[PDB]
Design a protein around this ligand. Sequence first.
Ligand SMILES: CCCCC/C=C\C/C=C\CCCCCCCCCC(=O)N[C@@H](CO[C@H]1O[C@H](CO)[C@H](O)[C@H](O)[C@H]1O)[C@H](O)[C@H](O)CCCCCCCCCCCCCC
Ligand SMILES: *[C@@H]1O[C@H](CO)[C@@H](O[C@@H]2O[C@H](CO)[C@@H](O)[C@H](O)[C@H]2NC(C)=O)[C@H](O)[C@H]1NC(C)=O
Ligand SMILES: *[C@@H]1O[C@H](CO)[C@@H](O)[C@H](O)[C@H]1NC(C)=O
Lengths: 221, 275, 214, 99
Amino acid sequence: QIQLVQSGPELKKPGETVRISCKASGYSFTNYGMHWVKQAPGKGLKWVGWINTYTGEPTYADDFKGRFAFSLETSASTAYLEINNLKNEDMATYLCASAAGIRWAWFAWWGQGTLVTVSAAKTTAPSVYPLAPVCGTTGSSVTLGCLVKGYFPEPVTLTWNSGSLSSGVHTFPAVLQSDLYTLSSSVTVTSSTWPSQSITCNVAHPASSTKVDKKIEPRGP
Amino acid sequence: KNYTFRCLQMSSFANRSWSRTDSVVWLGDLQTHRWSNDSATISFTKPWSQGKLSNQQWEKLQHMFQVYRVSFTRDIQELVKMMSPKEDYPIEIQLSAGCEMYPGNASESFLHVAFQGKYVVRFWGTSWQTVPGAPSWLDLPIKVLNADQGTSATVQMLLNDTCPLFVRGLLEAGKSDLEKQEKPVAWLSSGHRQLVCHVSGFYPKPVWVMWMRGDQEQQGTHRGDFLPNADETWYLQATLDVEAGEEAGLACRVKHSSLGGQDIILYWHHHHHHH
Amino acid sequence: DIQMTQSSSSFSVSLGDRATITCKASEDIYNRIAWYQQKPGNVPRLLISGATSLETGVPSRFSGSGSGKDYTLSITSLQTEDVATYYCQHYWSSPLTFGAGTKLELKRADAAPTVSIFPPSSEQLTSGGASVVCFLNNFYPKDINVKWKIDGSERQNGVLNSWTDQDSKDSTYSMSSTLTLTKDEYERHNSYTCEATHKTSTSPIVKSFNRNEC
Amino acid sequence: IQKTPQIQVYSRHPPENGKPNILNCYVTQFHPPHIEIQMLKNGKKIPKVEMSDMSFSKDWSFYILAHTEFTPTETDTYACRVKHASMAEPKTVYWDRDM
Ligand SMILES: CCCCC/C=C\C/C=C\CCCCCCCCCC(=O)N[C@@H](CO[C@H]1O[C@H](CO)[C@H](O)[C@H](O)[C@H]1O)[C@H](O)[C@H](O)CCCCCCCCCCCCCC
Ligand SMILES: *[C@@H]1O[C@H](CO)[C@@H](O[C@@H]2O[C@H](CO)[C@@H](O)[C@H](O)[C@H]2NC(C)=O)[C@H](O)[C@H]1NC(C)=O
Ligand SMILES: *[C@@H]1O[C@H](CO)[C@@H](O)[C@H](O)[C@H]1NC(C)=O
């Protein structure tokens, strides 16, 4: 039952501070030291350092000295990671892991991780654009698109016909366009089904209370 | 209840950046291996020290041990950070590991660890454990080390299988050394006034030395410690408290396996002692 | 600092095949190496520590090996359950460093991308901007190059790309490429081209549309 | 803690003058293992003194053997001097024999 539970996702602006927590249970807190690992969006694991849960003595990996500080409250078996003056390069998921010192630092137990998002942008609702095929078309099947542009923060949920159309869908990972997010999705059906049956793109952005439908229509003159 | 194979390790830790480790290996009371801190490889002290193991098999062991030595140092240096009293340098770790060989297939292995000259930890069965009496603070280090299953698994294989298998090799390979018979030579000499009977050059250890007046064994014969000679033979002295005039009629008698039933009988005189 | 460099960032294997991932340390780490499996969305899972010792949870098809600087993780026969990223890590001295990770993907017969191009919607145009979207769907292998052409000239500024992970069902990859312009810059030109070079064809797959045509 | 060394000087063979012999200095019962041992002839130290590898017996205390090849004469005295962390002053033990 050795278990590590971390604080929820954090959304912060450049320069601000963040304080992540990590409650341990199922073992004597003072036995194993607490390690911190950083993982930026699709980047692989970097060791931030560790703190001795008996003495309180921290050790920081060189790349994290200054701006990163480990503290703990032995009282309530909780470790803390504090990042000051947040920078874009800090935007990552931070995982806590308990292990004995450094020479026995293989990490069998991991916290679920805490995603810290660093961005100056304020909440913005997406624009949804129906993407219809080029004007005037042979081929057994046909491909329709949907463009979600300029929203913050993540995520949005895109469905087709309220979820009634999930086969032949590709919803792509969002990408940062300037300061905001842009995501696109493509659905493919047979020629006989469109525009015989109406296909509507559904986009929801919970952070701004936005629920928007767009019916895809063929093009004019 | 015969030959005991001992690997003796001496590690000294002065600063947190100075340490050395030296080892000697014994089969009974004959030195088979030496491994000083200076040397990257283990030394043979006897022509037959490689036992029955092939050069490749031996290479595998040497390598196994070289990894162990470096690893041991670093483990101890780190573990000192969580000891009591806090970082109590200097630190003297001693290890005594091997197996006692018996008739047939029977053998029992051992691994004993002494900290600051006191027996504290042994390897027992599948894990390290602190012995009764051992200081309270050792609990965390041993728990930490017991997480290293790889080590446990290796040590188990070494103790259960490797040791007895290797030593049988040695006992066969060095049979003509281990079974040598070396004859004792005796001489006499002088805050208690006493006569000293010196008995030197014998092998193996079992020896019988007694002061005697004729048939009568002198019960006041004090047997000394067994002292080693440079050439792997033994030295021992039996003393007897005597006042001036009690010397005449005394003799030193020596029974030893090498003599073939013909005991040394050495009679006393005016420094002119005789057979 | 001890560097931990894993040979490959990723390679494809036929389901069922023997896989071997090599991790090379910049200096002798005498067996103090751990292997981790991580899947997108999950936490790292420890497989092997001490070079060879498996965690009691881990299936026996996983296997750790090596000595000195060179260490290997091995899977006797890869299952679908095993497509993930694998990290090596030393714990010989501070600082602890992880390898860059080796992502295991699945091998598959080659498949050319289905390319579709999309001119800007009425809504976006009337709002000021104009995005030309190109989908490159269901292709293998993942290696693809997309090039934009406006009136036969290459265009580099303005494009944003997004890639999907290997499809859990059909083992294909997909890509979307978006060229974003102002309404004015867009109405300046005639033809917009989405051009894809891919293993499956010695000459690029070309999709165009003319702005003045229907 | 520390344990003070016990020095023992003895010859390999019956000591007769003019016959080659080996003198042994056997130091035991000390801790820690760092020790200085030299063998002396008439107060000046003997240059060629051979030293066994340090070892320890069951009680965990250290021991070491020093030995030197010598031919005893009637006018030569030999001793073994030891310096150790446990003793404030170096201990010298003389070879004693009937004369
Ligand atoms: C036959 C010829 C004779 C020559 C012998 C010469 C000298 C040695 C003689 C006697 C000493 C007895 C040696 C027995 C110890 C052998 C241990 C072998 C295992 C080893 O190398 N462990 C190494 C390396 O582990 C790695 O490598 C392994 C590969 O074998 C595994 O992959 C493992 O998972 C990985 O972590 C570990 O670092 C291990 O923890 C070293 C420490 C073992 C000794 C324990 C000491 C007792 C505890 C002391 C108390 C703590 C003091 C408080 C500060
Ligand atoms: C005992 O031997 C070890 C290994 O041969 C020595 O450790 C080396 O020490 C120097 C620092 O003086 C380092 O640069 C090397 O990295 C060390 N090598 C290893 C493998 O650890 C040690 O110094 C020797 N100790 C004594 C007292 O001579
Ligand atoms: C080694 O021996 C002990 C008994 O002394 C036993 O309990 C243990 O399981 C053995 N290990 C192996 C690997 O044979």
